[PDB]
Amino acid sequence: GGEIVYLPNLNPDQLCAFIHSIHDDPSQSANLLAEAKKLNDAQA
Amino acid sequence: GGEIVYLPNLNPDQLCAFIHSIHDDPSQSANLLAEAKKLNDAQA
């Protein structure tokens, strides 16, 4: 369980937000990187 | 170029600066990657 997602299409500030949300909301992490997957997808 | 550099031991605020550093100086990218890795290795 747990895929390794490459999201290079994010904004520097987006990573800052996303990562902050992982450590701050680790229980939501699944959802936070779910967004990130659509995030890099939107700016691909 | 192509090496995997995991830094999950970095705190959001700290790696935030690292990400913004890559944006500000993508030339030093790898070295900034190697730089932040020092903290990642320390907290490892």
Binding site: V5, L33 | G1, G2, V5, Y6, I22, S29, A30, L33
Partner: peptide, 21 residues
């Protein structure tokens, strides 16, 4: 230039990886 691709192992650990070639 050289940039770092941002990858993450979904469960706990986010990381980086360099990308140029």
């Amino acid at each position: 230039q050289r940039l770092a691709n941002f990858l993450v192992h979904s469960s706990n650990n986010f990381g980086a990886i360099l990308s140029s070639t």
